Design an enzyme around this catalytic site. Structure first.
Site, mmCIF file in Angstrom:
data_model
loop_
_atom_site.group_PDB
_atom_site.id
_atom_site.type_symbol
_atom_site.label_atom_id
_atom_site.label_comp_id
_atom_site.label_asym_id
_atom_site.label_seq_id
_atom_site.Cartn_x
_atom_site.Cartn_y
_atom_site.Cartn_z
ATOM 1 N N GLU B 370 0.848 -1.187 0.000
ATOM 2 C CA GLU B 370 0.000 0.000 0.000
ATOM 3 C C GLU B 370 0.881 1.232 0.000
ATOM 4 O O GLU B 370 0.583 2.252 -0.684
ATOM 5 C CB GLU B 370 -0.947 0.036 1.174
ATOM 6 C CG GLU B 370 -1.917 1.207 1.162
ATOM 7 C CD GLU B 370 -1.383 2.514 1.700
ATOM 8 O OE1 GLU B 370 -0.224 2.515 2.222
ATOM 9 O OE2 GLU B 370 -2.102 3.556 1.633
ATOM 10 N N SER B 567 -25.373 26.126 -19.524
ATOM 11 C CA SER B 567 -26.475 25.854 -18.633
ATOM 12 C C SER B 567 -26.276 24.626 -17.763
ATOM 13 O O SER B 567 -25.898 23.562 -18.225
ATOM 14 C CB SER B 567 -27.800 25.628 -19.387
ATOM 15 O OG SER B 567 -28.855 25.546 -18.395
ATOM 16 N N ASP B 605 -30.054 -6.116 -5.712
ATOM 17 C CA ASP B 605 -29.226 -5.874 -6.870
ATOM 18 C C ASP B 605 -29.334 -4.438 -7.270
ATOM 19 O O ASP B 605 -28.338 -3.816 -7.620
ATOM 20 C CB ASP B 605 -29.558 -6.820 -8.042
ATOM 21 C CG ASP B 605 -29.056 -8.198 -7.845
ATOM 22 O OD1 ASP B 605 -28.326 -8.445 -6.870
ATOM 23 O OD2 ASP B 605 -29.334 -9.086 -8.706
ATOM 24 N N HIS B 628 -15.517 7.120 -11.608
ATOM 25 C CA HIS B 628 -16.721 7.501 -10.899
ATOM 26 C C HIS B 628 -16.952 8.944 -11.273
ATOM 27 O O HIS B 628 -16.061 9.784 -11.160
ATOM 28 C CB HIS B 628 -16.491 7.464 -9.392
ATOM 29 C CG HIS B 628 -17.729 7.298 -8.550
ATOM 30 N ND1 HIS B 628 -18.643 8.312 -8.378
ATOM 31 C CD2 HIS B 628 -18.174 6.267 -7.817
ATOM 32 C CE1 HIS B 628 -19.582 7.918 -7.546
ATOM 33 N NE2 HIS B 628 -19.333 6.675 -7.196
HETATM 34 C C1 J21 Z 1 -0.230 13.879 7.169
HETATM 35 C C2 J21 Z 1 -0.407 14.727 5.940
HETATM 36 O O1 J21 Z 1 0.600 15.057 5.340
HETATM 37 N N1 J21 Z 1 -1.666 15.111 5.561
HETATM 38 C C3 J21 Z 1 -1.927 15.996 4.405
HETATM 39 C C4 J21 Z 1 -3.380 16.400 4.108
HETATM 40 O O2 J21 Z 1 -4.404 15.388 4.352
HETATM 41 C C5 J21 Z 1 -5.741 15.553 3.961
HETATM 42 C C6 J21 Z 1 -6.166 16.734 3.345
HETATM 43 C C7 J21 Z 1 -7.514 16.888 2.964
HETATM 44 BR BR1 J21 Z 1 -8.011 18.550 2.216
HETATM 45 C C8 J21 Z 1 -8.474 15.903 3.136
HETATM 46 C C9 J21 Z 1 -8.059 14.749 3.746
HETATM 47 C C10 J21 Z 1 -6.718 14.567 4.167
HETATM 48 C C11 J21 Z 1 -6.365 13.253 4.787
HETATM 49 O O3 J21 Z 1 -7.296 12.468 5.045
HETATM 50 N N2 J21 Z 1 -5.063 13.008 5.026
HETATM 51 C C12 J21 Z 1 -4.555 11.761 5.598
HETATM 52 C C13 J21 Z 1 -3.018 11.595 5.624
HETATM 53 C C14 J21 Z 1 -2.769 10.131 6.001
HETATM 54 C C15 J21 Z 1 -2.561 9.227 4.797
HETATM 55 C C16 J21 Z 1 -2.624 7.737 5.107
HETATM 56 N N3 J21 Z 1 -2.331 7.072 3.891
HETATM 57 C C17 J21 Z 1 -1.120 6.774 3.441
HETATM 58 O O4 J21 Z 1 -0.062 6.985 4.086
HETATM 59 N N4 J21 Z 1 -1.041 6.254 2.211
HETATM 60 C C18 J21 Z 1 0.241 6.275 1.492
HETATM 61 C C19 J21 Z 1 0.165 5.850 0.000
HETATM 62 C C20 J21 Z 1 -0.931 6.648 -0.729
HETATM 63 C C21 J21 Z 1 -0.892 6.466 -2.245
HETATM 64 O O5 J21 Z 1 0.215 6.059 -2.853
HETATM 65 O O6 J21 Z 1 -1.909 6.702 -2.941
HETATM 66 C C22 J21 Z 1 0.736 7.703 1.483
HETATM 67 O O7 J21 Z 1 -0.023 8.721 1.521
HETATM 68 O O8 J21 Z 1 2.057 7.863 1.389
HETATM 69 C C23 J21 Z 1 -3.971 7.332 5.578
HETATM 70 O O9 J21 Z 1 -4.966 7.306 4.706
HETATM 71 O O10 J21 Z 1 -4.183 7.021 6.707
HETATM 72 ZN ZN ZN Z 2 -1.302 3.040 5.726
HETATM 73 ZN ZN ZN Z 3 1.131 5.121 5.182
#
Ligand code: J21
Ligand code: ZN
Ligand code: ZN
Ligand SMILES: *[C@@H]1O[C@H](CO)[C@@H](O[C@@H]2O[C@H](CO)[C@@H](O[C@@H]3O[C@H](CO)[C@@H](O)[C@H](O[C@H]4O[C@H](CO)[C@@H](O)[C@H](O)[C@@H]4O)[C@@H]3O)[C@H](O)[C@H]2NC(C)=O)[C@H](O)[C@H]1NC(C)=O
Ligand SMILES: *[C@@H]1O[C@H](CO)[C@@H](O[C@@H]2O[C@H](CO)[C@@H](O[C@@H]3O[C@H](CO)[C@@H](O)[C@H](O[C@H]4O[C@H](CO)[C@@H](O)[C@H](O)[C@@H]4O)[C@@H]3O)[C@H](O)[C@H]2NC(C)=O)[C@H](O)[C@H]1NC(C)=O
Ligand code: J21
Ligand SMILES: *[C@@H]1O[C@H](CO)[C@@H](O[C@@H]2O[C@H](CO)[C@@H](O)[C@H](O)[C@H]2NC(C)=O)[C@H](O)[C@H]1NC(C)=O
Ligand SMILES: *[C@@H]1O[C@H](CO)[C@@H](O[C@@H]2O[C@H](CO)[C@@H](O)[C@H](O)[C@H]2NC(C)=O)[C@H](O)[C@H]1NC(C)=O
Ligand SMILES: *[C@@H]1O[C@H](CO)[C@@H](O[C@@H]2O[C@H](CO)[C@@H](O)[C@H](O)[C@H]2NC(C)=O)[C@H](O)[C@H]1NC(C)=O
Ligand SMILES: *[C@@H]1O[C@H](CO)[C@@H](O[C@@H]2O[C@H](CO)[C@@H](O)[C@H](O)[C@H]2NC(C)=O)[C@H](O)[C@H]1NC(C)=O
Ligand SMILES: *[C@@H]1O[C@H](CO)[C@@H](O[C@@H]2O[C@H](CO)[C@@H](O)[C@H](O)[C@H]2NC(C)=O)[C@H](O)[C@H]1NC(C)=O
Ligand SMILES: *[C@@H]1O[C@H](CO)[C@@H](O[C@@H]2O[C@H](CO)[C@@H](O)[C@H](O)[C@H]2NC(C)=O)[C@H](O)[C@H]1NC(C)=O
Ligand code: NAG
Ligand code: NAG
Ligand code: NAG
Ligand code: NAG
Ligand code: NAG
Ligand code: NAG
Ligand code: CA
Ligand code: CA
Ligand code: CL
Ligand code: CL
Ligand code: ZN
Ligand code: ZN
Lengths: 689, 689
Positions: B370, B567, B605, B628
């Site tokens: 991931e 529109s 369904d 989507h």
């Molecule tokens: C901590 C930070 O810098 N936050 C920045 C802004 O975050 C948000 C901004 C808005 Br506007 C709306 C929502 C968020 C948000 O939900 N941020 C979550 C950060 C945490 C990311 C966590 N995911 C992951 O680490 N995935 C990996 C791989 C993802 C990929 O390859 O697509 C990566 O992200 O490197 C996770 O989902 O728990």
């Molecule tokens: Zn993670």
């Molecule tokens: Zn992560």
């Protein structure tokens, strides 16, 4: 009993005859008032016949029509610019119809306007290989030339594309008696041959499944955004026009330059069939000039959509569809098919009025604008694609019921092979000399399959008809059936009339009746069998055949297969797996607990979604609407089906590619895609959890 | 009774604690032996816990790793080429783990190799608007510069894309205490803040849903054909590296050129935050030099796939999935989520061993890679897309269970809003001061929705997690839930450990338990309610909200809307229709004949395929895997969801386009697409025949 026999016995030859007569007294050209009136009639009668609902679905699509006050024609023109010879402006109309108005004169629908002038090159059928021969072997250059080609062998849109890619500045299509005059038979009205003044209308698009040139992907509804003409899908960039063999003789008789390369290039007219360019010395300064003034216009079209609600699975659709629009009278094309559908509806409605309902929902369609590119079926499917994807059991086409009077012709998905065998064994042959024998027996005798002794030929689906959206875009199991010969000469000509059919093809309407029983029978079974009548094992058999075939094409290049490590192992492995899994699924389908309806619905869903599993949502390269990985229309001939088309086209002419590493890479890529999709389809038949 | 309460009561806080401890003693970096060993353990225990089958599914995908003998670092370099300052080669490891091997040093996964040298420009968060400000307003040119950016606000891949489009030759990311040091809290190990030597790992890809960079569309299985690196999806073209705020201070403290444009550009370090380019006069001839030697390598990864076969609809899949790979120890990310899943499995297995089965099939997944781009979930979905399209009821994600300890956070499809409201009213708040109150009540009090009084905030799904393939590609109803704050400082750092969680976030494991009840509860309901627990009316409400929103953006340009006849009527009409049809469908779902299982299956369904109906098989422009039409990840920030993304991006910055006719055309086109898809989705809820 309300069973198939009851349905089948209610169908009457005399009814189909009355309807054919009714549908063929005036022209029903798409987008014209007369075709709207017939839609309204069909809608009213299907209602009266008993269907639960009957609606018109309309779209505003790009159509094409000649200019009534500025006619299209072709000239030989002299050094001064005098037109010393002009092709005809209309076909002589048949006896008794010489006062019918609104007969559209012959034209090539969607041709751009122009008046190009130049020397002729004669290109035989304008096939890919005809142009290879001309350019590669004979060293003739079509660039800036007007090409003349005989109709036949491949879809005319492919001819025009091919001419255009060779740098032609115009195309002339004509009907050669070698291809459209059967020995010993007389010209219309005295027989079923094409007269010298007869001409084949037809569109010259390369849509590759797109539907309306202006709205690819989406229905051409009231608020649609349309591309500009320059970005429209599939339009030709050079003017095109069709002519009969009287006029063709006048254009060809003075041809000079090189002789024809061999006898497969010579038709039956009394001319040498020289390739050109240009005319022999005395006339070398005469030229050919086309005058095309047709216009493309966004025009409203109307499908009729009839519903017979299912009693047990109303959310499962079996579709019987065929078109209603015609070039002129549509005596064979489509009305011989539409009259059959009309009687089918009548018979289903009879049963319904006595309280019966099919198990699944049956949808009946009268499509518009099929002649202009399958536009009415394609737009309706674009509109309803979600319903069709998730609910569509099967699609049975219903264009012309006859193109001959010799035997049955069936083209369909392997999933319907067993269904067609079984139904045809229960039907009576209408053939002379097989009185009291089954249709299976006569058909098998006259059209033996090449593979299996004691079985009949069933062909793959190609295209050039309204099943294309359903089968090759959406992956709904599809089929078609008609009587055929051992195309037909009067195809798309004014001479295709009620009388042509009543006098020369089917005076007793027995071949029509047989076709209505096959079509109707298929729909009845699809719509009423408890277990869907598909046999996944028949797919397994053909998949191996196609894999052997495509492997053999590759193996013409043993050295490149070594150098680039080209293996078909994955594809054969996938086909093996599909065969094993399909076999185990069939055992379960036989042995499963018959009382349990969810188990039943699960297993019918697995059968329904099997055809669906061959769809790649990414489509084929540069052809996003051809998504089925096993079957696409040939890139060289829209009418013909090609198996493993992705691999086939990657291999085609590969010895000519300048970067062989890249070309062979793409072959391997297409092998991967196909093996994967075969395996993925097989896995939909595994136990589900 | 075997009911939800029984499931919920079997879940234990103490169990989740034991599992978290077990999953976090050594690093489990994707593609390493240790992560393979943990997969094998998870597989063995899920088997022991009772699941019917538990398999590993493996793929060979592009990963990225630093060179162990050639470390990555950044230098200030003088006029001679002496490196007078070097960033750190590793994070100081936390107490008690200073002898753990195989801690991957900080790096930006998928960075190309290079040693570019140049002047710095400081670009704030490297957002679209930061670059607009810099280029448009301040007239600073990033071309050939090394940019330095602070982490935060948007996904780091978007930062890098943005830098690259501005002509940067490298990017330096760092963690500013303004964004990663909470006031009054101490640095790890004495509190939960980021130390100056801490660094945030993370990939910097722009995959737009593709999965494995080398195999877009198809699973990376044994016979896959792979693109060459040059044609790979989503790789950055300039070197990138992350650093902590001790090192960042050293790079920023000498910055010259223009002052920051305003205070939103200043972090909390004791430096001016000048934008540059380059350093103040005395050092103006010093430069920054990056040294990046990471390599991309095709590496095997392993998902664990557990099945609990359904009793009544085994061909209907409710999926609970979350990842297992971690940057280092994964104390929060992912193992706080994975330990929750493990206990959920245990509890479902308990019931199963006593003879229960859910109504529908439940699939449990432990995804790999991931962190490297959602690769394990995406590849498995590519492999199984046909099964998922036709059988997938719902997907519940299960990454980190906590990012704070204040209240619940839910992001999900509108189709699950009612389900989440109802479940949360039946659960106990774990919060101090809401003893004996429901989770709904505490959540609603601390996170009120902006729209409705007496309801809680539920956000749209964005991306940056493993639901992306399921929701935005395949259109399977999806959701996620965790405890959150009022990101977290130690995100993707070596300091994210078991002890961080046990000491500072959740010593009693009560927030974890609450999260396991919400996640588990959702799955239980989805998998066992007779009627699927989706309310189509909640979609109708949000659709109107999004339409109002996108209309309002357009209306900033009233003159162009007049000139180009822009529109939104069609879209509002479609939303009206969806509202009416949804309302009538709900009446039927309430009043339909409860005894009839086909009617039930038809209507379930229709509920299952509703999310599916928002998928356009053509995808969004230039983003074929975001299909989507209502929700895509923001083109500017992968983490954030955007509604009506096709229209949003057509409107974005439109006043800058040089051909406004063309730009406004494309806005109208996207309106057409959206209205059509909304209407088409609504029609799937009409009576079926
Ligand atoms: C901590 C930070 O810098 N936050 C920045 C802004 O975050 C948000 C901004 C808005 Br506007 C709306 C929502 C968020 C948000 O939900 N941020 C979550 C950060 C945490 C990311 C966590 N995911 C992951 O680490 N995935 C990996 C791989 C993802 C990929 O390859 O697509 C990566 O992200 O490197 C996770 O989902 O728990
Ligand atoms: Zn993670
Ligand atoms: Zn992560
Ligand atoms: C048709 O169905 C059959 C199953 O009945 C199916 O067989 C599968 O084949 C794949 C390989 O094509 C097998 O993959 C192997 O899986 C094991 C783990 O189980 C791995 O260790 C293997 O990898 C090692 O060896 C490879 C081979 O040289 C090396 O390249 C690799 O680097 C590793 O050293 C390999 O991945 C798979 O296990 C079977 N599955 C079963 C249940 O037998 C076949 O794939 C199906 N055909 C298609 C086209 O899908
Ligand atoms: C939401 O649902 C409503 C239905 O409850 C649905 O209304 C439909 O609107 C379309 C137009 O947008 C109607 O289309 C008309 O159909 C008649 C035939 O029934 C035609 O004659 C009309 O065309 C003429 O008039 C047009 C309007 O000025 C001209 O442009 C045209 O050239 C013709 O002169 C027109 O095509 C349709 O009949 C209704 N259907 C029903 C059952 O009321 C609406 O479309 C749905 N919204 C969306 C976004 O799908
Ligand atoms: C008569 C002739 O020239 N035949 C040439 C070769 O035919 C075949 C070759 C091979 Br190889 C395999 C199959 C065929 C074949 O089945 N040909 C049928 C010709 C009749 C076409 C008839 N369709 C239609 O007229 N459609 C319309 C619109 C089609 C479109 O826009 O896509 C058109 O085609 O202009 C019909 O399906 O009945
Ligand atoms: C084709 O058949 C239809 C119906 O049998 C004929 O349509 C009827 O025409 C008369 C007007 O003479 C009306 O009384 C009916 O209302 C029509 N019914 C419908 C449903 O349209 C039609 O005239 C026939 N056409 C030809 C050429 O024979
Ligand atoms: C071919 O048709 C063209 C066009 O109708 C004929 O040429 C026209 O004839 C009249 C003389 O009657 C002139 O006023 C026009 O200027 C001509 N037009 C052009 C474009 O040449 C031509 O005579 C016909 N040729 C034959 C053999 O019938
Ligand atoms: C075509 O007919 C054959 C022969 O009746 C059907 O195959 C039989 O189906 C029954 C009912 O499952 C089996 O118990 C027999 O064993 C089958 N016989 C053979 C030789 O296979 C076949 O199912 C029919 N095909 C379709 C689509 O209905
Ligand atoms: C995590 O927990 C597992 C299982 O409880 C431990 O794995 C067991 O390890 C011992 C070797 O000491 C074996 O007897 C068992 O075969 C293992 N079981 C499985 C399913 O792998 C593992 O050691 C624990 N890890 C840590 C770090 O505590
Ligand atoms: C930054 O690291 C570099 C590389 O390790 C150091 O420069 C190297 O130092 C030795 C002298 O001990 C030389 O033999 C190498 O030639 C140097 N390499 C390069 C590329 O300059 C540098 O000393 C370190 N700087 C600081 C301040 O610690
Ligand atoms: C959430 O709970 C509400 C209230 O119990 C459910 O709505 C009720 O559902 C029953 C059973 O259909 C109806 O007869 C009641 O009329 C409904 N009450 C209200 C106020 O709507 C609702 O169905 C639940 N949501 C989900 C997804 O289960
Ligand atoms: C048809 O040709 C006439 C007369 O030469 C011309 O005035 C008219 O514009 C053309 N019609 C169309 C629809 O192009
Ligand atoms: C064909 O003819 C035109 C002559 O004008 C030329 O431009 C083109 O290159 C020629 N091609 C070949 C293969 O001779
Ligand atoms: C009808 O059948 C006869 C008998 O073979 C045949 O000779 C005649 O050509 C057929 N008609 C047509 C149009 O094919
Ligand atoms: C890592 O760097 C070393 C030593 O400087 C080099 O020899 C090796 O090739 C590199 N490893 C990889 C996988 O590129
Ligand atoms: C930015 O800088 C580089 C200087 O080498 C130049 O090529 C590019 O055109 C400049 N762009 C602008 C908008 O000044
Ligand atoms: C745990 O809750 C307390 C009480 O509000 C809070 O002050 C502390 O900051 C929380 N811990 C974390 C990591 O957020
Ligand atoms: Ca369209
Ligand atoms: Ca892939
Ligand atoms: Cl047909
Ligand atoms: Cl999550
Ligand atoms: Zn036809
Ligand atoms: Zn036709």
């Amino acid at each position: 009993k309300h069973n198939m026999k009851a349905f089948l016995d209610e169908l009457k030859a005399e009814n189909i005859k009355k309807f054919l007569y009714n549908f063929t007294q005036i022209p029903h050209l798409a987008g014209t008032e007369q075709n709207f009136q017939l839609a309204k009639q069909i809608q009213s009668q299907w209602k009266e016949f008993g269907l639960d609902s009957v609606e018109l679905a309309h779209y505003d699509v790009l159509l094409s029509y000649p200019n009534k006050t500025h006619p299209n024609y072709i000239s030989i023109i002299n050094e001064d610019g005098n037109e010393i010879f002009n092709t005809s402006l209309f076909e002589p109309p048949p006896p008794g119809y010489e006062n019918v108005s609104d007969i559209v004169p012959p034209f090539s629908a969607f041709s751009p306007q122009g008046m190009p002038e130049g020397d002729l090159v004669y290109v035989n059928y304008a096939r890919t290989e005809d142009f290879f021969k001309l350019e590669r072997d004979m060293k003739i250059n079509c660039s800036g030339k007007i090409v003349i080609a005989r109709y036949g062998k491949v879809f005319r849109g492919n001819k025009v594309k091919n001419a255009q890619l060779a740098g032609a500045k115009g195309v002339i299509l004509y009907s050669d008696p070698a291809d459209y005059f059967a020995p010993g038979v007389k010209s219309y009205p005295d027989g079923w041959n094409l007269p010298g003044g007869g001409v084949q209308r037809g569109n010259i698009l390369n849509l590759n499944g797109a539907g309306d040139p202006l709205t690819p992907g989406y229905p051409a509804n009231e608020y649609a955004y349309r591309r500009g003409i320059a970005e429209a899908v599939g339009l030709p960039s050079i003017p095109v026009h069709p002519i009969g063999y009287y006029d063709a003789q006048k254009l060809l008789e003075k041809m000079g330059g090189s002789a024809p390369p061999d006898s497969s290039w010579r038709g039956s007219l009394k001319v040498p069939y020289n390739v050109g360019p240009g005319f022999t010395g005395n006339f070398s300064t005469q030229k050919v000039k086309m005058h095309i003034h047709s216009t493309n216009e966004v025009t409203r079209i109307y499908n009729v959509i009839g519903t017979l609600r299912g009693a047990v699975e109303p959310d499962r659709y079996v579709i019987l569809g065929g078109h209603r629009d015609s070039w002129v009278f549509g005596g064979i094309d489509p009305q011989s098919g539409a009259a059959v559908v009309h009687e089918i509806v009548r018979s289903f409605g009879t049963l319904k009025k006595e309280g019966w309902r099919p198990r699944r929902t049956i949808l009946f369609a009268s499509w518009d604008a099929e002649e202009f590119g399958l536009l009415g079926s394609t737009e309706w499917a674009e509109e309803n694609s979600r319903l069709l994807q998730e609910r569509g059991v099967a699609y049975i086409n219903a264009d012309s019921s006859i193109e001959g009077n010799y035997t049955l012709r069936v083209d369909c998905t392997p999933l319907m092979y067993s269904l067609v065998h079984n139904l045809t064994k229960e039907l009576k042959s209408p053939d002379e000399g097989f009185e009291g024998k089954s249709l299976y027996e006569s058909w098998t005798k006259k059209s033996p399959s090449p593979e299996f002794s004691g079985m009949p030929r069933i062909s793959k689906l190609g295209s050039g008809n309204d099943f294309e959206v359903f089968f090759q875009r959406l992956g709904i199991a599809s089929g078609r059936a008609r009587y055929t010969k051992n195309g037909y000469p009067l195809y798309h000509s004014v001479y295709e009339t009620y009388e042509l059919v009543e006098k020369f093809y089917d005076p007793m309407f027995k071949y029509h009746l047989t076709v209505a029983q096959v079509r109707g029978g298929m729909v009845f079974e699809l719509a009423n069998s408890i277990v869907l009548p598909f046999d996944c094992r028949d797919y397994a058999v053909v998949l191996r055949k196609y894999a052997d075939k495509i492997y053999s094409i590759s193996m013409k290049h043993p050295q490149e297969m070594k150098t680039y490590s080209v293996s078909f192992d994955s594809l054969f492995s996938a086909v093996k797996n599909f065969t094993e899994i399909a076999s185990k699924f069939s055992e379960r389908l036989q042995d499963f607990d018959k009382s349990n309806p969810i188990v039943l619905r699960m297993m019918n869903d697995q059968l329904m979604f099997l055809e669906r599993a061959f769809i790649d949502p990414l489509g084929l390269p540069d052809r996003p609407f051809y998504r089925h990985v096993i079957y696409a229309p040939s890139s060289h001939n829209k009418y013909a089906g090609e198996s493993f088309p992705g691999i086939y086209d990657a291999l085609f002419d590969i010895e000519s590619k300048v970067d062989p590493s890249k070309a062979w890479g793409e072959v391997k890529r297409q092998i991967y895609v196909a093996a994967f999709t075969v395996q993925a389809a097989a896995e939909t038949l595994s136990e589900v959890a």
